[PDB]
Write a protein that binds this ligand. Structure first.
Ligand SMILES: CC(C)CN(C[C@@H](O)[C@H](Cc1cc(F)cc(F)c1)NC(=O)O[C@H]1[C@H]2CO[C@H]3OC[C@@H]1[C@H]3C2)S(=O)(=O)c1ccc2nc(NC3CC3)sc2c1
Ligand SMILES: [Cl-]
Lengths: 99, 99
């Protein structure tokens, strides 16, 4: 799909059998989700945003569906005001910005 | 132009006669720049990112050139780890996400 930016670019995701919404975020290198259970091992990671840092769990090779597209990639789980899909997963969709 | 997302989507801006780089940031409602002098009156504003909040200066009806395109809009000045162009200005470029 093509979307304009008058509204927040929010898409449906399915991850670990959980349905959520998340923002397609070209300003995010990595994908950060708050509200999710993932199985198995993870690595501590500190990430830096506007207004400081948060501690997240890095989960690797997580299967995730973004607006119908199945991809596998790194997901960070931790406090974020908004679930965000980063460039790590949007590149797997072949996503582009046009102006 | 069209750009892919394997790299950060960085563009050149000109604002208040000052040249800078900034991220085209679909996850940002508003535009936030750190390294800038703007003339005249402004309003206190608190904005929330990953890792918390920052106090910014809201400047209204600021002229800004983004990859060649002259627009006028609201600019927030304050601490951000990366200059970000938000949807408030990307809608003026007719920017779209495609996948
Ligand atoms: C600031 C950017 C440069 C980085 N961020 C992405 C932005 O898109 C956020 C998204 C977001 C939207 C929200 F709704 C709420 C939020 F908390 C966050 N936008 C934002 O904060 O916008 C602000 C301001 C703009 O206007 C308004 O709109 C919303 C608010 C408000 C004020 S990030 O989240 O810090 C980020 C993400 C992944 C990541 N991966 C990394 N990789 C590792 C280092 C190797 S570093 C890294 C950093
Ligand atoms: Cl690129």
């Amino acid at each position: 799909p093509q979307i304009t930016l008058w509204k927040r670019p929010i898409v449906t995701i399915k991850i670990g059998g959980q349905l959520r919404e998340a923002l397609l975020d070209t300003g995010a290198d990595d994908t950060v989700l708050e509200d999710i259970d993932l199985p198995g091992r993870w690595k501590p990671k500190l990430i830096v945003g506007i207004g400081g840092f948060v501690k997240v769990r890095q989960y690797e090779q997580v299967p995730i569906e973004i607006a119908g597209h199945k991809v596998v990639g790194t997901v960070l789980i931790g406090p974020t005001p908004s679930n965000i899909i980063g460039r790590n997963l949007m590149t797997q969709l072949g996503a582009t910005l046009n102006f």
